[PDB]
Amino acid sequence: ACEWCIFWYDPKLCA
Amino acid sequence: CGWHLRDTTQVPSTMKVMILDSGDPNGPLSRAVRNQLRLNGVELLDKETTRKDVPSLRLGKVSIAKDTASVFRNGQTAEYQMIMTVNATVLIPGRDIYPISAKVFRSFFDNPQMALAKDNEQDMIVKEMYDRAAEQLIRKLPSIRAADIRS
Amino acid sequence: DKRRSGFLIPNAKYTTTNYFEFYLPYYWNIAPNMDATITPHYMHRRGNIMWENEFRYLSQAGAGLMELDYLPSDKVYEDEHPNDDSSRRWLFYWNHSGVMDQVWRFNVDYTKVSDPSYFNDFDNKYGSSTDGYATQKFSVGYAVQNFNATVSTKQFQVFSEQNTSSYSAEPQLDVNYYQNDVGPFDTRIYGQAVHFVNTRDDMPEATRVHLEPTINLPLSNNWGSINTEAKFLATHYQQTNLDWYNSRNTTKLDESVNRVMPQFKVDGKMVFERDMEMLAPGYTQTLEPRAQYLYVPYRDQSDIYNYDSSLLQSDYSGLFRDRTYGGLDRIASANQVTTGVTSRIYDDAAVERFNISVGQIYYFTESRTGDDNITWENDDKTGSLVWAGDTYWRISERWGLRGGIQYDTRLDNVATSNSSIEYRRDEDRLVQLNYHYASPEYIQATLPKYYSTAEQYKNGISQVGAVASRPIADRWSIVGAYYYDTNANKQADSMLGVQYSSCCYAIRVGYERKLNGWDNDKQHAVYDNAIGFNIELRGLSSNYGLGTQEMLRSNILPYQNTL
Ligand SMILES: CCCCCCCCCCCCO[C@@H]1O[C@H](CO)[C@@H](O[C@H]2O[C@H](CO)[C@@H](O)[C@H](O)[C@H]2O)[C@H](O)[C@H]1O
Ligand SMILES: CCCCCCCCCCCCO[C@@H]1O[C@H](CO)[C@@H](O[C@H]2O[C@H](CO)[C@@H](O)[C@H](O)[C@H]2O)[C@H](O)[C@H]1O
Ligand SMILES: *CCS(=O)(=O)N1CN(S(=O)(=O)CC*)CN(S(=O)(=O)CC*)C1
């Protein structure tokens, strides 16, 4: 539920 | 980075043909809503047409308020806040009636020395809020479609 | 209906302005569509009864309210103005609104007072001590689906005795025509004829005629949109009574002026979507880039007096607006591109939970109206000059926060900003915090010079407000508000309200301390205290509320719902 993912998210960071 | 172009229309496919109904069909809100629906490729019908299974969009009360948001050291108004509230409803004929709303916030500074000018500014702001209140309502159409499928 | 007409319950209040005040209302049911009220309002300090007459009506043309307050004499005003022959104080108010046959639109918003200090002395029912002027508008319009023509007159009674000169449109005619399927284009024509008159006899009078045809090409996709627009502006000015201004100003006003200008606008928008599974299952994010190129040639408008053009505030929505000024006396030249971006969040139910926007305006050339009297803090003319940001977060069902910020590099400081966080369980249970800011540089740039030199204006705005409302035992309702200016470290407005509601009656007690004026003899602010007591009879109607929203709007900075 990390809300700060809005301004930074990248699919391969997850996996 | 995960982004893709929107592959779905802003207006849901079942709402591509609909009836726009209001008690003030020639008013400014109705004009704004009709223009926004025309921009999205929506076919608007008259309320007397015989086509059925056509969702209806009934616009309701519109309230515009002008209040004092801040004051100077002498107690005179510095900033006016204008509030637009629009209540509408969507009737899906077989299913159900879903109500939606829109609230628009704008502000502008006062100037007693240029009161006439300020009045025109106010008018322009109102003309904008209607448009801002229209896109808001169309933006809630996909939410209605999702609620329709859920029930 | 003599059965339904009679005396209401008297209410009272103690004020610092008028000491003990006493109202004795009398309701009168003339008809099922027309009702009236007569209220003797005795003020002790002025030692006299002022008569309030209120009249509501519903007709075919719409619904309206008339109000007339008359005070034959006033001891306080007589003391403050010995030279005046009479100390009578009156107010006339008329508000009518209606649409008849769906085509005729009738609007009246008229206020007139006997003296500028009326609202600082008497209670604020159809006005306020916060207003700097009184407005008098009449408008009759005819509007069908593709046409509308409105004739209106606007007048203003300015209160502050710095410069009581004010321009009026007597009358103003507005005509709009629309076409939508002429080929692939959309077309509209806007016409206007106006006549500006002034209160003083030495200021210019004008007649303006304006024509404006626009043609636009919209193109749309599921993910993108681009709208091109070509607009034409043709204005004709006939100005008279120019001897005074020309004899005192170095730039000369011209009798006959013609102003012809093209305008080209290109607007484009894209929508990107992505899946945000880390927030919660089903949530999605949307990115919305928007760009707009605006080009308006430069015409020197120094020979036209500025009658009704004022600087427009540039929030995020106003970044993409194609005008710098309101009205039509100042059309700024433009060679600019506006770039902005909006991010939105939806849940599994496709409901917007959060949105944030940021944008800027890049000027390729300086915007000129021929005359430029705006006092900037630096000589920046081109580049990224204006920035605006907006945000709205619906944290939960009972929480919500809003924010907006404006930055101007020519001010070398944030121009204006505002924020508000509100908890609202229900119309009786709520808490709200809000903040308003306006830099002194912004006041200097966008307001007259004596605002920059006057103590009560020059420091800008830095205001923090708190509003709270809490019921007890379903019968009581406590309401409070407090507004504090951090620049002066002084109270601006505070309110307290307690209402006891029962089956047959409701008793309201309210206190308020507000900024009421400015005393320039030793240069401080003047406050006013008011403690009121009011009883109203229940049961006759369907209203059973605790009255919280009524007391929340009773102060000079009324509460507004922001979710
Ligand atoms: C002040 C400047 C701007 C500040 C910027 C802050 C940006 C924050 C963006 C928040 C976006 C939406 O935030 C999202 O809210 C929802 C709704 O409660 C939370 O979701 C939560 O409640 C929902 C609804 O009951 C549950 O289904 C979910 O399991 C739970 O986590 C998400 O965990 C959070 O990610
Ligand atoms: C990018 C998207 C933005 C989303 C919306 C963000 C909303 C932000 C709301 C900001 C609320 C606080 O508002 C902020 O108040 C402070 C404190 O007075 C002002 O800051 C001020 O501080 C002191 C004076 O007090 C000066 O030294 C400074 O130069 C001046 O700016 C800010 O200019 C204003 O922005
Ligand atoms: C803000 C989300 S992130 O920076 O891209 N991030 C990547 N992952 S993930 O959120 O699990 C992507 C599915 C790991 N983290 S996190 O700790 O899980 C963020 C709450 C960072």
Author numbering:
A (entry chain C): 1 to 15
B (entry chain B): 999 to 1149
C (entry chain A): 222 to 784
Quote the study that presented this structure, word for word:
LPS biogenesis systems are essential in most Gram-negative bacteria, with LptDE responsible for the delivery of LPS to the outer leaflet of the OM. The outer-membrane associated β-barrel is made up of 26 antiparallel β-strands (β1−β26). These β-strands are connected by turns on the periplasmic side and extended loops on the extracellular face that fold over the lumen of the barrel and require rearrangement to allow LPS molecules to reach the external surface. LptE is tightly bound in the LptD β-barrel.
The reconstruction of this Bicycle-molecule bound state shows additional density consistent with the lipid tails extending from the N-terminal cysteine of the molecule. Since our other ligand bound structures or previously reported structures of the LptDE complex have not shown density for the lipoprotein tail, we speculate that the presence of the Bicycle molecule stabilized this region of LptE. All Bicycle molecules had a protein binding face and a detergent binding face, with protein contacts being stabilized mostly via hydrophobic interactions. Overall, the backbone of SfLptDE showed little rearrangement upon Bicycle molecule binding compared to the apo conformation.
